[PDB]
Amino acid sequence: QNYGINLPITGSMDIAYALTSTLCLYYPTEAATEINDNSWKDTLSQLFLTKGWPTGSVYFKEYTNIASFSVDPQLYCDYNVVLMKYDATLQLDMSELADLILNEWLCNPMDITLYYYQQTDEANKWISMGSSCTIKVCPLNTQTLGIGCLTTDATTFEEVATAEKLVITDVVDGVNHKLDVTTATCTIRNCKKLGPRENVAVIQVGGSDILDITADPTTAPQTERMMRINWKKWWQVFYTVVDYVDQIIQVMSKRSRSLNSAAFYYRV
Amino acid sequence: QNYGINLPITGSMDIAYATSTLCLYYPTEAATEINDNSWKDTLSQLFLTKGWPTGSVYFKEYTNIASFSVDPQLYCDYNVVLMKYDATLQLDMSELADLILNEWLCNPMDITLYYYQQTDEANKWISMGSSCTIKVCPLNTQTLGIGCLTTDATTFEEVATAEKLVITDVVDGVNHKLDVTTATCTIRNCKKLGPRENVAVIQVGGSDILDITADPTTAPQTERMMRINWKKWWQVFYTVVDYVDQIIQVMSKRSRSLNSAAFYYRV
Amino acid sequence: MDVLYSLSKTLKDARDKIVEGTLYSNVSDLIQQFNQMIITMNGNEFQTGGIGNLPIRNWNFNFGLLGTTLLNLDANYVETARNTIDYFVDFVDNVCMDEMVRESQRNGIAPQSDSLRKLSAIKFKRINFDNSSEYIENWNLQNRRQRTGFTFHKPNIFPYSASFTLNRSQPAHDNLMGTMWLNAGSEIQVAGFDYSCAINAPANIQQFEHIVPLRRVLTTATITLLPDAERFSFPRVINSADGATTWFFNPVILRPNNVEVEFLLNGQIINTYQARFGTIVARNFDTIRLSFQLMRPPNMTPAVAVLFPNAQPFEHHATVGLTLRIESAVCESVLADASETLLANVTSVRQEYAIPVGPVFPPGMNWTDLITNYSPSREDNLQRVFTVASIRSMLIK
Amino acid sequence: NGQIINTYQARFGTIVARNFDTIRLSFQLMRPPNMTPAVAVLFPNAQPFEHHATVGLTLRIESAVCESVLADASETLLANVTSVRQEYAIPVGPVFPPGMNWTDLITNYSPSREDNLQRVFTVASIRSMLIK
Amino acid sequence: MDVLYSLSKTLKDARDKIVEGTLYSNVSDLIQQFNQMIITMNGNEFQTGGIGNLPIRNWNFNFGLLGTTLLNLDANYVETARNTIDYFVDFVDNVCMDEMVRESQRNGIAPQSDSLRKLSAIKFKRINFDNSSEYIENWNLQNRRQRTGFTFHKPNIFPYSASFTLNRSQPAHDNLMGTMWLNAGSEIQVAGFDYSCAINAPANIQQFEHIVPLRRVLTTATITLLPDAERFSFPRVINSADGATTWFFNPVILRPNNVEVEFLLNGQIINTYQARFGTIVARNFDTIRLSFQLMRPPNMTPAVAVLFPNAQPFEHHATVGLTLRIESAVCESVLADASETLLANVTSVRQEYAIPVGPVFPPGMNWTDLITNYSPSREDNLQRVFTVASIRSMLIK
Amino acid sequence: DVFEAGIDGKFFAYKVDTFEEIPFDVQKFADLVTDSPVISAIIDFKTLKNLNDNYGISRQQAFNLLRSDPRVLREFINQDNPIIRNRIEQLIMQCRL
Amino acid sequence: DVFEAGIDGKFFAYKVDTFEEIPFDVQKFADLVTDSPVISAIIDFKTLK
Ligand SMILES: [Ca+2]
Ligand SMILES: [Ca+2]
Ligand SMILES: [Ca+2]
Ligand SMILES: [Ca+2]
Ligand SMILES: [Ca+2]
Ligand SMILES: [Ca+2]
Ligand SMILES: [Zn+2]
């Protein structure tokens, strides 16, 4: 009832204190194509009901590729589990997608044709999404003159992305930059990493554990919600998910931002 | 965990105590009349005097109120929307103002299968899209239409036709079947939570015509709903820049939401 | 202390009874007391003062006894008696001030001034007379560890505190529920306010509570309880809890329903009054608990329906109040009240002579601080100084 | 006598004034530097002021000591003197105002009025010793 | 009470001093006291017990005096004395138990058993002898209205509390800042923890406070202050504030920065110690305020730096603690300490005889509840029962 | 004798030992001001009077306060004297701009 | 009382009249150095004694 303030919470260390949610499972079209059964979503729904999820509470979302899914991955669901297929040549794409869907980002607009931009903190990145992002940056010295680049001529700019569906650019903090994003197809925002997003978990179905969701090169944390499995059959993958849904949910948690106590703290 | 919302705050009645972003939504008419390539740069410089550092003021352009009402987005900490009065669009202005100024919590509404009813006065049906055509047939306790055959939609009572944004209010506690044109429209079951101090509306021209409450016995004029007489868009922009202090003082940025959507979606 | 009181009482009875023309049968016993006082005090040297700006003064007693051969007092007898009484009264005044300006963490009730320490010897017990006044009576009772009692008119039992507690609020402070209160002296004014007028509350009833713990146990108190807090019924602009901003309060008063005033002692409900206003009695308590509810009127005329909407904009804020005044009470400890001037006298002496701040009392005898932290040492010192102040007031007008 | 004897700064509740003849209260209205929207709507920059800011003080003399006789809440000597004069229809004299009007008496508490008032108060107390 | 103490003291002295072969000059005064006690007690009738399972007993005294004419006592004298001593000791034992098992909400300091009420009479004042034990002398001093003091080794002044407060918190409990504490008996262990190690705090310093108020003022206290809270330095799984879930605490201990310990009386700083550990002295206080900072190490070797990243994943949580032990103290009111057995005696008697719970003490004489709600009536009853317990323990072992 | 006067037209005359007012001679004030170096009454007469009444400051402390000694002023500030702290806060807030 | 301290690390406390060493107290020393005027010990305590 006292929203927007931070009142200390006091609790006891020597006292004993002796379903309604909704789950969304994101998978690639390859899974459905291999399963090759029309009623497979209904079958999984019945098995989830056996596990304790009332029918109609498990949604099955299909994305064609990691690259396509990276374009605005809207996950509105009490719990979200994303089965992403490992590809050896898409390690950075997988890491970017995992970071975007596993952390909370507060993003402001960027009109690169009016303003130069600098990142003020280690948690401030430039997240750009769209059909084709081609980010080309020119750092500027204190005279607003390009360093190693020409402010007037874009072809001298230094390119940090090429036709990327999703990219998280991190430039040297505290220095102004002039950007040449291809805004005709891709939109770029100045984002700040508030913290982890408890709603979402990602299961890498394939190769080794390569995700790192920290720009800092000295750390590659492997949180609870970043899981990894080996596979040869999508039916086996889905059976594993259904059977261990309880463990997955326990590893995850309800989204802190959407809790009705986060009112005036960047949600509700 | 809960920020201690359940605990109280005790304050005294005597003890003396004594980079935000600003979005400006404007119609294309304003840009056309201004007819300058660098007017955004000029206004940025002028805002710098009022104290908003360069890079903090953003300018969003929308072709019309109708188009801007199709899933409007609130980008900055303080969102000021300049709405051009048109005597033939009063309800559209009211609906857009309600949607942006008030917080909403919306749930999905699959209409091809389920009957729906409004629960309390705080519940509405908000539909947005290129063309939202809504026909409602109320049902009695026996699940038979009242003045409309359930099977035939031509007997349904139309509520909106080719509208970009509709806030439908039907009689509470009675089921309805809706023949909403879902091809170009998305309809959601929403509840109004409270005011959104993040956004303010400035109406240029007109005669103070905005009802942001479904209740007919109340047409509140909050402090964030403002009106100015206008004849030059340069004059309007200079007014906004010169008085940004008052507008911000009347607004509050704690209502900034994580996403730019005008409503909170829950599945 | 008893000897000092006896000196003061003898001098007062002399200044009032020994008047020209009065029969000697009216003053025979008093003159015997006066002569014994003179005999006991003769040949003793006293020193008073030396602290702050209180001057050091020396007192020597070599006086003759009042005569006893007259059947009626004449001008000369009264003149000689007055000449002796003036010096004795000056000595008593200086002893009382010297005692009042002093404190001690340990043995607060023990005499602190050199003069009073000397008077505490056994040779001076011969002059004791009658201890009739309220304060000396309670002094003797507490010395023997009996039940003391002081009767106060509007006891100053509540420290000044004007505050508010919010139970529902937001950054914009445009929809608030909570309570505001002033506790001052013997009066509690508490107003619970709800901006939504319990539109969404369960049963359209919003509960408010206010707990005022007293620092001492009052007994046999007459209390006036009125159904409205006039102090919180006008528009206000109030600092926010943290102080960053200010919020607006625009009260509109409704009657408080389910008013329950509970007087408790050690957490046990001793008295309870429901929907009762006017003069009530609390026989023994140390906590007051006021419970009152704001109930949304089930039926509203148009001018009230306009006032109380269901949408958020809440121009007028429902408010329900209570006022509670302690007209008179009895306390085992000593308190400042509206009818006695003892605290005023002690503070006046300290301020007049610029007594340095001591280790027991707060600076300037601040009653807010005294009552807020009324420790046993402070109670002992305060009772001693109040008793000395009453003794002084017996003589000094 | 125009000289400061006691001064209290920003202190409320019970205070003590040892010896005084004039009270000077000073207080300031400070415009809040920060205001929520509801507060800011009240105080505009321009003439049409609807709500008017005010700041108050209430000073009550609980008890005091005076070398001159005064009417007070606890004693009934003023009531006795006024009652006797009213009952027996005493013509207005040259000292006291009509009807023993206390407002006039204390607005112009001249020394002759003080002498006569002390005399009548003493006699009234003597009378009340006997007559109920 | 003085008479009861004199009875027990006389009986103990008779047990210790009346031994075979001792010179009668060694016990002449004792035998005079014993004969005086016998004379005073002769012809009086007493009743004890009747509450709980304590049997109803009747006592009559028709004893003969003791010889006073031998040079050295012999076996006959010792046996003749012991026969009377056994009966008197049994009477004192039962009277003491009857007094212990009882309580009164009003005037708890006065005798409660009928036997002690009878001994309160003037006729029994001839039995006074000596008042030299700590508890009896404090009793007499209190009655005389002088300063009292009980010296305690490890006084149980802190009600048992074990709890935490979270200043920063989330539902996931992944990034927490706050404090945890155990206040038990005569020790305070406090630990402020921050999961981010003040990465984003102003000046990379997080401030922690812990205030422990006492129910009674302690004087001349010797205290040990040490810079680590050993109780909060290991991995823990605690349960949330409302009990919904559980959160993890994996502490890594840093030195506490800017350690300030303030001992306050009436809200004013009486003692204050800065960055000083070991033995300290608090002369007079009723509140302990501990302030300490977690300061992020400005310089870190790689092994240290790897612990504290700047992103959310925090596997080690920086904790800084203090431990404060009150070794000895002096208090005006009775308490339970580690050296005395009075609380044990009272509780043991009540439990053995199954006394129904009364109107004053908590069930089972629970010391935590008693010291939590240490009220005036509770203090009076507790002092009375402790004095009687000491009197009884003089004789029973 | 201490003669104090302010821009706001309030003038006082008191004694160094006991801060008790005396008649204010404007001529004598002018004569002393012309030559003797004036002291900025950081702790004004009202503040000094309140402090002496409610705290009974020492003779040395009163001397230093009248001379406006930073040592005594800061000693009181650190000692948390509400009167001195209120006066200093008043000055800081009056330093608006 | 005189409190003297040097950059090298030598600190002394003594009395003005007779230069008798007293135990140093670095809380009083800090207070005195921050408030009171500081004297440059041209003639240090060693040479003074
Ligand atoms: Ca990518
Ligand atoms: Ca280049
Ligand atoms: Ca960067
Ligand atoms: Ca129809
Ligand atoms: Ca519309
Ligand atoms: Ca409706
Ligand atoms: Zn031990």
Contact list in E for residue B2 (CB cut-off 8 A) is 171
Cβ proximity of A180 and A136 under 8 Å? yes
Distance from CA of E170 to the nearest CA of A (A): 7
Q: Which residues in chain C touch residue B98, judged by CB atoms under 8 angstroms apart?
A: none
> Computed from CA positions of residues C265, C270, C276, C278, in that sequence, does the dihedral angle turn out positive or negative?
negative
CA-nearest residue to C355 within chain F is F56
Report the 10 Å Cβ neighbour count for C130: 12
Using a CB-CB distance cutoff of 8 angstroms, which residues of chain D are in contact with residue C244?
A: 34
- In DSSP notation, C106-132 reads SSTTS--SHHHHHHTSGGGGG------
- Closest-CA distance, B36 to chain A, in angstroms, reads 14
CA distance B256 to chain A (A): 6
The neighbour count for residue E268, using CB atoms within 10 Å, is 14
**Cβ-defined contact of F50 to D3 (cutoff 8 Å):** no
A200-205 and A79-85: which strand pairing? parallel
CB A258 within 8 A of CB A268: yes
3-state secondary structure of C259: strand
CA distance A268 to A200: 19
Q: Which ligand is nearest to the CA of A168?
A: 1
Cα–Cα dist D122/D128, whole Å: 10
Decide if B11 contacts C164 (C-beta within 8 A).
Answer: yes
Q: What is d(CA E391, CA F35) in angstroms, rounded to the nearest whole number? A: 81
Q: Give the Cβ contact number of residue E18 at 10 Å.
A: 22
Write out the two tokens for G41. Answer: 């010990």
The alpha carbon of residue C213 is apart from the nearest alpha carbon of chain B, in Å, by 16
Q: Is G47 left (phi over 0), alpha (psi -120 to 50) or beta?
A: alpha
Structural tokens at position D55:
């700041």
User: In this structure, are residues C3 and C119 in contact, taking their beta carbons and an 8 Å threshold?
Assistant: yes
Neighbours of E121 (CB within 10 A): 10
**Distance (Å, rounded) from C-alpha D104 to C-alpha C203?**
58
| Dihedral sign for Cα atoms in the order A72, A77, A81, A83 | negative
B with A: touching (≥3 Cβ pairs within 8 Å): yes
How open is the CA angle C168-C173-C175, to the nearest 5 degrees? 55
- DSSP strand pairing (B9-12 vs C158-168): antiparallel
Give the three-class secondary structure for E235.
Answer: coil
Name every chain C residue with its beta carbon within 8 A of the beta carbon of D32: 237, 239, 245-246
The answer for residues whose C-beta is within 8 angstroms of residue B100's C-beta and 6 or more apart is B72, B74, B79, B81, B196, B199, B201, B262
- Closest residue, chain E, to B6 (C-alpha): E242
E182 Cα to the center of ligand 7, angstroms: 20
Distances A152 to A111, A140, A177, C145 between C-alpha atoms, Å: 17, 12, 13, 97
Minimum distance, in Å, between the CA of residue A9 and any CA atom of chain E:
5
Which tokens is D46 given?
């321009």
**Nearest Cβ partner of C167 from B8, B217, B222?**
B8
Mention every residue, 6+ apart, whose C-beta is less than 8 A from residue C123.
Answer: C40
Angle between helices E376-393 and E342-353 (to 10 degrees): 90
Q: Which segments within chain F are labelled E, that is strand?
A: 2-5, 11-14
Closest by CA to B98, choosing from B227, B191, B8, B211, is B211
Looking up tokens 């920003």, which residue turns up?
D10
Run of H or E including A73:
none
Chain A contact probe: residue of C170, C175, C245 with most A CBs at under 10 A: C170
Minimal C-alpha gap between D8 and chain F (Å): 7
Interface size between B and C, measured as CB pairs under 8 A: 65
φ, ψ for residue D31, nearest 5 deg: -65, 125
- Please calculate the CA angle A178-A183-A187 and round it to the nearest 5 degrees: 95
Backbone φ and ψ for B180, nearest 5 degrees, come out as: -85, 135
Residue C152 · residue C328 · CB < 8 Å: yes
Q: Determine contact: D35 vs chain B, CB below 8 A.
A: yes
Cβ–Cβ below 8 Å for A13 and E309: no
B210 in the Ramachandran plot: left (φ > 0), alpha (ψ -120 to 50) or beta? Answer: beta
The answer to whether residues C232 and C180 touch, using CB atoms and an 8 Å cutoff, is yes
b/e map A125-137, b = 16+ CB within 10 Å: bbbbbbeebbbbb
**E strands, E186-275, in order:** 187-194, 205-226, 236-239, 246-249, 251-253, 257-265, 268-274
Whole-number Å distance between alpha carbons of A208 and A196: 23
What is the C-alpha to C-alpha distance for residues F94 and F90, in angstroms, rounded to an integer? 6
- Calpha distance B23→B253 (Å, rounded): 12
E neighbours by CB contacts (3+ pairs under 8 Å) = A, B, C
Q: Which ligand is nearest to the CA of A163?
A: 1
Closest C-alpha to A258, from A214, A198, A202, A201: A198
Backbone angles phi, psi at D64, to 5 degrees: -160, 170
Cα E162 versus chain centre, distance: 19
B39: phi then psi, degrees, rounded to nearest 5: -65, -30
Which residues, 6 or more positions from B27, have their beta carbon under 8 angstroms from its beta carbon? B61, B62, B63, B64, B65, B82, B84
Are the C-beta atoms of E306 and E239 separated by less than 8 Å? Answer: no
- Asked whether the beta carbons of residue A2 and residue C171 sit closer than 8 angstroms, the reply is no
* Calpha distance E324→E225 (Å, rounded): 5
Task: Write out the DSSP string of C346-360.
Answer: HHHHHHHTTPPP-SS
Instruction: Name the resolution in angstroms.
Output: 2.7
- Do chains D and E meet with 3 or more Cβ pairs nearer than 8 Å? no
The alpha carbon of A81 is separated from its chain's Cα centroid by a whole number of angstroms, namely 12
Experimental method: cryo-EM
Residue A166 known to bind ligand: yes
The three-state secondary structure class of D39 is helix
Per the annotation, where are the binding residues of E?
A: 153, 266, 286
- Residues of C within 8 A of E214 (CB-CB) are none
Residue D85's Cβ-side half-sphere holds a number of Cα atoms within 13 Å equal to 19
CA E320 to chain centre: 30
Under a CB-based contact definition with an 8 Å cutoff, are residues C27 and C95 in contact? no
Closest listed residue to residue E285, CA positions, set E301, E304, E271, E303: E271
Cα separation, E252 vs E319, in Å, equals 6
Which of D20, D62, D72 to mutate to probe the C interface, most C CBs <10 Å? D62
Closest listed residue to residue E138, CA positions, set E336, E321, E359, E331: E331
Contacts of range E387-390, beta carbons closer than 8 Å, 24 or more positions apart: E387/E1, E387/E5, E387/E135, E387/E136, E387/E139, E388/E1, E388/E4, E388/E96, E388/E99, E388/E100, E389/E96, E389/E100, E389/E342, E389/E345, E389/E346, E390/E133, E390/E134, E390/E135, E390/E136, E390/E342
Distance CA A111, CA D7 (A): 62
* Contact (CB<8Å) F49/D3: no
Which residue in E has a C-alpha nearest to residue B1's C-alpha? E170
β-pair partners for E61: none
Give the closest of A22, A106, A109 to B258, CB-based: A106
Binding-site positions of B:
36, 92, 95, 118, 147, 155, 157, 163, 165, 169-170, 172, 242
* C359 touching chain F per CB within 8 A: no
Determine the distance in angstroms separating the CA of C97 from the nearest CA of chain D, rounded to an integer.
14
In angstroms, the Cα distances linking A104 to A101, A191, A196, D130 are: 8, 10, 6, 90
SS3 A41: helix
**Radius of gyration (Cα) for chain C, nearest Å?**
29
- Which residues, other chains included, contact F84 with Cβ-Cβ below 8 Å and sequence gap of 6+? F43, F47, F51, F73, F76, F77
Please, which residues bridge with residue E180 across strands? Answer: E164, E191
- Give me the residue from A2, A263, A264 closest to C166, CB to CB: A2
Structure tokens at A187: 């939109």
In angstroms, what is the C-alpha Rg of chain A?
21
Beta carbon pairs, C and F, within 8 Å = 24
* Greatest extent of chain A over all pairs of C-alpha atoms, in Å: 70
Cα(A26)–Cα(A84) distance, rounded to whole angstroms?
8
Cβ-based interface (< 8 Å): residues of D facing C: 6, 11-14, 16, 18-19, 32, 34-39, 42, 51, 53, 62-65, 67, 74
Tokens coding A189: 């925002």
The beta-carbon neighbor of D41 closest among B18, B223, B252 is B223
Cα–Cα distance for residue pair A173/A180, rounded to 1 Å: 18
Contact call for residues E330 and E150 (beta carbons, < 8 A) = yes
- Sheet of A226-229: strands edge to edge? A58-63, A23-28, A79-85, A200-205, A226-229
Q: Give how far Cα A46 sits from Cα of A23, B56, B111, Å.
A: 14, 52, 24
Q: Are C78 and C9 in contact (CB under 8 A)?
A: no
Rounded distance between C-alpha atoms, residue C227 and residue C189, angstroms: 10
Nearest CA in chain F to G32: F71
- The SS3 assignment for C240 reads coil
H or E, element range at A177: strand A177-179
Distance CA G34, CA A206 (A): 68
Residue A203 pairs in a beta bridge with A83, A227
Query: Longest C-alpha distance within chain F, in Å?
Result: 39
Quick one: which H or E segment has residue D104?
A: helix D102-107
Distance between Cα A87 and ligand 1 center (Å): 13
DSSP string, B98-162: HHHHEEEEEEE--TTT--B---STTEEEEEEEEEEEEEEEEB-TTS-BSSS-SS-GGGSEEEEEE
Closest CA to B124 of B158, B170, B165, B161: B170
Q: Does D53 touch chain B (CB under 8 A)?
A: no
CB B228 within 8 A of CB B246: no
3 state DSSP class of E267: coil
Are B44 and B227 contacting, i.e. CB atoms less than 8 angstroms apart? no
Amino acid identity, position E184: A
Contacts with C341 from chain D: Cβ below 8 Å: 63-65
Residue A106 Cα to ligand 7 midpoint, Å, equals 58
CA B19 to chain centre: 25
Nearest one of B43, B37, B88, B39 to B66, comparing CA atoms: B88
